Amino acid sequence: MFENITTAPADPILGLADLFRADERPGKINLGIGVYKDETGKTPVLTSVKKAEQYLLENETTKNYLGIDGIPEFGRCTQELLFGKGSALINDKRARTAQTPGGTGALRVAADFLAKNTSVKRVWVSNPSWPNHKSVFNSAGLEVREYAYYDAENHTLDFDALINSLNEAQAGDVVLFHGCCHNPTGIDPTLEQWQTLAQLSVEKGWLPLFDFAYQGFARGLEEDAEGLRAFAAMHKELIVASSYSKNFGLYNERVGACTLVAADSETVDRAFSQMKAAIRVNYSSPPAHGASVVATILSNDALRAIWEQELTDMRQRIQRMRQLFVNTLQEKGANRDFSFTIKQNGMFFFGGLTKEQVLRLREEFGVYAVASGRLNVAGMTPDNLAPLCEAIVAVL
Amino acid sequence: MFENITTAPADPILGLADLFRADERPGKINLGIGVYKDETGKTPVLTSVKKAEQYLLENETTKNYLGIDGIPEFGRCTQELLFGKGSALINDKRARTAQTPGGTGALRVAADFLAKNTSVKRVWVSNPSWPNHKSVFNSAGLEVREYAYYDAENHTLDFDALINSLNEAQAGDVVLFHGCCHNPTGIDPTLEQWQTLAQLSVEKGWLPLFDFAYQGFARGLEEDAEGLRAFAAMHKELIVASSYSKNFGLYNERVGACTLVAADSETVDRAFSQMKAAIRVNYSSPPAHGASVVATILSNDALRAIWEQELTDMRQRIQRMRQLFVNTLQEKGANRDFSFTIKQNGMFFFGGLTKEQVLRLREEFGVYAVASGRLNVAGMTPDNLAPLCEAIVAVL
Ligand SMILES: *Cc1c(COP(=O)(O)O)cnc(C)c1O
Ligand SMILES: *Cc1c(COP(=O)(O)O)cnc(C)c1O
């Protein structure tokens, strides 16, 4: 039965891990997958997380199944983090949250839900966008269309082009937005541009779907959510797929959430029942450990204070490495100004390298990056910055 | 967009949890969902598990993403547990294992894989069978057909009827078998019946799919796998969806595995690449905690010895409660012989109650069981056995 199966194409991002591993050269530098690394080049477990795990080990008395939607406390803390402590959405009980295996899991659940229970047939994603967005929605049988976003010449958000392209989007179509720290461009809409998009979305009748995987890495927890909150103030319905992989450093514990918002509690409850149905036939119920840690931290004033500072330190180290990256490039004699990367939010640097330059950096220098030219700044350290820049200058 | 969504039907098993919770009557007894309970009526964390978690807390240095297929050690230990320490399948590298979010997750991955990469169009399940089997495969777009299995009059395996019904199954069809502790009948094929089924399957050209969620609860770890191993000795290809939820008491950590077997390593690798593709667009990579615990226990002689004894104690308490259940029924004056339940393997008692008797036990006595008449014996304790039996006798 498996004689004629074709070999699946490698993932453009996750597939780098296997290549980086096979490579046996000493000075190899991994700047691919978007995981945080400290000054030592390691991806440590946060202290707040380790303290929460200690707590769980000491107080957990059972591993009995969680409900389909997961830990209730986790859902409440998530909604407050997304919409604001005293949001009307929460008070009017218009939102339901399902704990999921990561933000990717959240996206898949959203996709299955839409495909089976609504008239949705098309999803619009930015150009360029996170590669797995097309793959996930296509798997659910939904077609994916792209809308203009990045101005490759000026390294900015081409708002006029964004508006023009989205006018081809029809009422009932889903439009996907990155909450903050757009992956891979690092360029986000200004608060006024978000407000304009919110208004346009209501009038055009689009169903907004936010992929919120970097809350806290642009400016701050609350600040990074203003675009989403601008949308939530005017929309009757919306879906949010968030992740705690990066801001809690819980990558492998698969911790995320899919939040559904409707006009009223009666409607969201009915709709959420079908979302639970979609979960039931996938993995049944979500993994407890990771989400337990998150709920424990967010609900304890002391632990939350430690975590928030750790998040702050992460964001600040990336920003520092960014300015240092640009400085070292000019010092090493780069024949191009990359100062535009200072305007980018998040962990990545994007827009200055071609596919061939990336391949050459890998083959000749052992520097690993995504074929699209996306570099993980969070993977840069004071120790590998010099050789990194010498390699880059060598391929320009 | 969500105005016309219909309320999804409640799950016949997982939905009991919500009903049992709403119930405020004092003496309510929960015998629904198949989770183990000790003499105290609690579902404790195994000691071997708690020791492994202590180990992880002390030695884990990162939460970085696992590969798509999970922890390699977890996969090796799983294959040895399934096929035997020195199996040819392992030596000839004909099997690949993907760590999944529970056995249900394993089933979904298998379903997506089959639907997208093979000519499979039909899956055969036993009558009666675990309800979520139909739901999971149907969700992937595969039709489900039933084959005769249980003899409701004699409370035994109707082998002749099984053979007759499966003759309508065509080459290229998938036939699903419960490794041991058939859910919900508790009636398994004898080793000779397994051998006969293995031979017939090869000649008919069926693709076997084993759901192995109770290894260790029938007779023992090795013994419970002889049926699967009989199949693995004659088949070129097969799929195994196993779970560690019950034998490790890790229900909410979602720990399972989907094992793929092919004629040779070259073929299984090609096929497994497409299985990884199916995972990639679902939840990306599996949750680490639960699987880490399992790998830690199985790979450490000391911890494994403690765990195996705990598994043994679990199996033995259920068997004891079974004989006590039958004894108390006759002592309380039941007007029917239920001694046939002694022949049943696993956590359940099945075949003696009608749908109405189950409803009445719930409404009038606060006793919760599955509408099909399946009772969780593992939920019976020396303290609730008396009132339980008085209620049952009252509805016969
Ligand atoms: C990290 C990320 C996610 C979700 O990641 P998970 O590891 O599955 O939680 C989703 N979308 C984008 C754009 C991301 O960067
Ligand atoms: C328990 C069980 C499973 C899998 O359960 P998970 O909790 O998802 O690991 C699968 N099939 C049957 C018949 C089961 O009893």
* CB-count burial class (<10 Å; 0-12, 13-18, 19+) for B147: buried
Q: Please name every residue paired with A39 in a beta bridge, in sequence order, or none if there are none.
A: none
Contact B117 A5 (CB under 8 A): yes
Shortest-distance Cα residue to atom 4 of ligand 2: B103
- Strands B122-127 and B143-148 turn out to be parallel
* Partner residue opposite B44 with nearest CB, options A62, A118, A263: A62
First to last CA, chain A: 49
Q: Binding site for L-aspartate: what residues of B are annotated?
A: 34, 130, 183, 374
Structure token pair of residue A188: 């986000």
What lies within 8 Å, CB to CB, of A181 at 6+ separation is A188, A213, A214, A217, A218, A224, A345, A346, A347
- Strands A143-148 and A150-151 turn out to be unpaired
Contact A255, B254 (CB under 8 A): no
Contact A71, B54 (CB under 8 A): no
Closest residue of B to A102, CA-based? B283
Q: Rounded to the nearest 5°, which phi and psi values hold at A310?
A: -60, -40
For the CA of A256, the nearest atom of ligand 1: 9
Amino acid at A148: A
**Mind giving me the DSSP string for B120-184?**
--EEEEEES--HHHHHHHHHTT-EEEEEE-EETTTTEE-HHHHHHHHTTPPTT-EEEEESSS-TT
Residue A304 and residue A297: Cα distance in Å, rounded?
5
Q: Please name every residue paired with B156 in a beta bridge, in sequence order, or none if there are none.
A: B151
Residue B89 and residue B97: Cα distance in Å, rounded?
12
CA A204 vs CA A164, A199, A258: distances in Å: 13, 9, 24
The rounded Å distance from CA B130 to ligand 2 centre is: 9
CA atoms lying within 13 Å on the CB side of residue A156: 6
| Least Cα separation, residue B44 to chain A (angstroms) | 5
CB atoms within 10 A of CB B342: 12
Q: Rounded to the nearest 5°, which phi and psi values hold at B249?
A: 65, 35
CB atoms within 10 A of CB A245: 26
First to last CA, chain B: 49
Contact A246, A34 (CB under 8 A): yes
Residue A330 and residue A334: Cα distance in Å, rounded?
5
Contact A130, A183 (CB under 8 A): yes
B245 lines ligand 2 (CB under 6 A): yes
CA atoms lying within 13 Å on the CB side of residue B24: 0
B248 lines ligand 2 (CB under 6 A): no
Structure token pair of residue B151: 């003899």
Nearest to A369 by CA among A184, A144, A178, A147: A184
Nearest to A102 by CA among A225, A326, A282: A282
B128 lines ligand 2 (CB under 6 A): no
Structure token pair of residue A106: 């959240």
Nearest to B370 by CA among B361, B382, B380: B361
- For A96-125, letters b (16+ CB in 10 Å) and e give bbbbbbbbbbbbbbbbbbbbebbebeebbb
- For B107-122, letters b (16+ CB in 10 Å) and e give bbbbbbbbbebbebee
Closest residue of B to A109, CA-based? B282
CA atoms lying within 13 Å on the CB side of residue B209: 27
Amino acid at A304: R
Residue A281 and residue B138: Cα distance in Å, rounded?
9
Between CA B304 and CA B310, with CA B307 as vertex, the angle to 5 degrees is: 155
Closest residue of B to A250, CA-based? B63
Complete edge-to-edge strand list for the sheet that includes strand B95-100? B95-100, B256-261, B238-243, B207-212, B174-178, B122-127, B143-148
Q: Please name every residue paired with A238 in a beta bridge, in sequence order, or none if there are none.
A: A261
Q: Which ligand is nearest to the CA of B291?
A: 2
Nearest to B272 by CA among A334, A7, A132: A7
Residue B35 and residue B20: Cα distance in Å, rounded?
14
Choosing among 2.60.120.10, 3.40.640.10, 2.40.30.130, 3.40.50.300, the CATH entry for B45-315 is 3.40.640.10
Contact B208, B199 (CB under 8 A): no
Peptide bond into A72 cis (omega under 30): no
What lies within 8 Å, CB to CB, of B15 at 6+ separation is none
Helices (H), chain A: 15-22, 47-59, 72-83, 88-91, 102-117, 131-139, 159-166, 191-204, 226-234, 265-280, 288-298, 301-331, 355-365, 385-395
Residues of B in contact with A285 (CB under 8 A): 14, 102, 252, 254
Q: Which ligand is nearest to the CA of B241?
A: 2
CB atoms within 10 A of CB B333: 10
Nearest to B77 by CA among B274, B292, B275: B292
Residues of A in contact with B254 (CB under 8 A): 101, 283-288
Contact A281 B5 (CB under 8 A): no
**Mind giving me the DSSP string for A185-218?**
T-----HHHHHHHHHHHHHHT-EEEEEE--TTSS
Contact A34, A251 (CB under 8 A): no
Nearest to A106 by CA among A78, A125, A72: A78
- Residue with token string 């995972």: B279
Contact B250 A33 (CB under 8 A): no
Contact A42 B61 (CB under 8 A): yes
Residue B321 and residue A377: Cα distance in Å, rounded?
60
Residue A260 and residue A99: Cα distance in Å, rounded?
12
Cα-Cα-Cα-Cα dihedral sign, residues B213, B219, B225, B226: negative
3-state secondary structure of B90: helix
What lies within 8 Å, CB to CB, of B159 at 6+ separation is B189, B193
Residue B247 and residue B297: Cα distance in Å, rounded?
12
- Strands A207-212 and A238-243 turn out to be parallel
Mutate to test the pocket of ligand 2, among B104, B134, B178, B370 (most ligand atoms within 8 A of CB): B104
Structure token pair of residue A271: 């709709």
The rounded Å distance from CA B213 to ligand 2 centre is: 5
How much is the CA Rg of chain B, to the nearest whole Å?
21
Q: What is the dihedral of CA B73, B74, B75, B76, to 10 degrees?
A: 50
Q: Testing the interface with B: which of A18, A281, A285, A293 to mutate, by most B Cβ within 10 A?
A: A281
Complete edge-to-edge strand list for the sheet that includes strand A174-178? A95-100, A256-261, A238-243, A207-212, A174-178, A122-127, A143-148
Contact A31, A375 (CB under 8 A): yes
Nearest to A169 by CA among A129, A124, A199, A134: A124
Indicate if A246 belongs to the active site: yes
Structure token pair of residue A346: 């998040």
What lies within 8 Å, CB to CB, of A10 at 6+ separation is A18
Q: Which protein residues touch ligand 1 with a CB less than 6 Å away?
A: A 34, 102-104, 130, 183, 211, 213, 243, 245-246, 256; B 284
What lies within 8 Å, CB to CB, of A80 at 6+ separation is A87, A90
How much is the CA Rg of chain A, to the nearest whole Å?
21
Residues of A in contact with B139 (CB under 8 A): 281-282
* Partner residue opposite A57 with nearest CB, options B2, B53, B254: B53
Between CA A132 and CA A139, with CA A136 as vertex, the angle to 5 degrees is: 135
- For B79-97, letters b (16+ CB in 10 Å) and e give bebbbbeebebbeeebbbb
What lies within 8 Å, CB to CB, of B55 at 6+ separation is B296
What lies within 8 Å, CB to CB, of A63 at 6+ separation is A288, B43, B45, B49, B249, B250, B251, B252, B253
- What's the helix, strand, coil split of chain A in %, to 5? 45, 15, 40
Contact B129, B146 (CB under 8 A): yes
Residue A49 and residue A60: Cα distance in Å, rounded?
16
Q: What is the dihedral of CA B238, B241, B247, B251, to 10 degrees?
A: 180
DSSP state of B338: -
Judged by phi (left if over 0) then psi (alpha if -120 to 50, else beta), residue B375 lies in beta
* Partner residue opposite B66 with nearest CB, options A6, A252, A263: A252
CATH 3.90.1150.10 fits A11-44+316-396, yes or no: yes
Contact A289, A253 (CB under 8 A): yes
Residue A196 and residue A24: Cα distance in Å, rounded?
51
CB atoms within 10 A of CB B251: 26
Nearest to A45 by CA among A315, A219, A290: A290
CA A318 vs CA A183, A345, A384: distances in Å: 15, 10, 14
User: How many cross-chain Cβ pairs, A to B, lie less than 8 Å apart?
Assistant: 226
Contact A120 B53 (CB under 8 A): no
Residue A133 and residue A131: Cα distance in Å, rounded?
5
Peptide bond into B184 cis (omega under 30): yes
Contact A217, A314 (CB under 8 A): yes
Residue A118 and residue A140: Cα distance in Å, rounded?
13
Residue A223 and residue A179: Cα distance in Å, rounded?
11
Contact B104 A284 (CB under 8 A): yes
Indicate if A130 belongs to the active site: yes
Contact A49, A293 (CB under 8 A): yes
The rounded Å distance from CA B337 to ligand 2 centre is: 30
What lies within 8 Å, CB to CB, of B182 at 6+ separation is B126, B149, B188, B345, B346
CB atoms within 10 A of CB A221: 16
Contact A43, A36 (CB under 8 A): yes
- Residue with token string 């704990």: A99
Residues of B in contact with A135 (CB under 8 A): 280-281
Residue A373 and residue A385: Cα distance in Å, rounded?
17
Contact A63 B45 (CB under 8 A): yes
For the CA of B246, the nearest atom of ligand 2: 1
* Partner residue opposite B207 with nearest CB, options A1, A263, A286: A1
Q: What is the dihedral of CA A153, A159, A165, A171, to 10 degrees?
A: 160
CB atoms within 10 A of CB A215: 24
Residues of A in contact with B253 (CB under 8 A): 63, 287-289
Residue A391 and residue A151: Cα distance in Å, rounded?
26
The rounded Å distance from CA A318 to ligand 2 centre is: 44
Beta strands in chain B (DSSP E): 29-30, 95-100, 122-127, 143-148, 150-151, 156-157, 174-178, 207-212, 238-243, 256-261, 348-349, 367-368, 375-376
Residue A197 and residue A175: Cα distance in Å, rounded?
11
Residue B359 and residue B363: Cα distance in Å, rounded?
6
Shortest-distance Cα residue to atom 1 of ligand 2: B213
Cα-Cα-Cα-Cα dihedral sign, residues B192, B194, B199, B203: positive
Residue B387 and residue B350: Cα distance in Å, rounded?
19
Q: Testing the interface with A: which of B284, B285, B293, B376 to mutate, by most A Cβ within 10 A?
A: B284
Q: Please name every residue paired with B124 in a beta bridge, in sequence order, or none if there are none.
A: B145, B175
Residue B372 and residue A76: Cα distance in Å, rounded?
36
Q: Rounded to the nearest 5°, which phi and psi values hold at B375?
A: -110, 140
Contact B136, A281 (CB under 8 A): yes
State this model's resolution in angstroms.
Answer: 2.0
- For B148-179, letters b (16+ CB in 10 Å) and e give bbbbeeebebbbeebeebbeebeeebbbbbbb
Residues of B tagged active-site: 130, 211, 246
Between CA B176 and CA B183, with CA B179 as vertex, the angle to 5 degrees is: 80
Do A11-44+316-396 and A45-315 show the same overall fold? no
Q: Binding site for L-aspartate: what residues of A are annotated?
A: 34, 130, 183, 374
- Strands A156-157 and A256-261 turn out to be unpaired
Q: How many residues does chain A have?
A: 396
Contact B340, B323 (CB under 8 A): no
Helices (H), B332-382: 355-365
Residue-range domain boundaries for chain A: 11-44+316-396, 45-315
Q: How many residues does chain B have?
A: 396
CA atoms lying within 13 Å on the CB side of residue B89: 29
Between CA B276 and CA B283, with CA B282 as vertex, the angle to 5 degrees is: 90
Q: Which of A69, A112, A173, A211 is catalytic?
A: A211
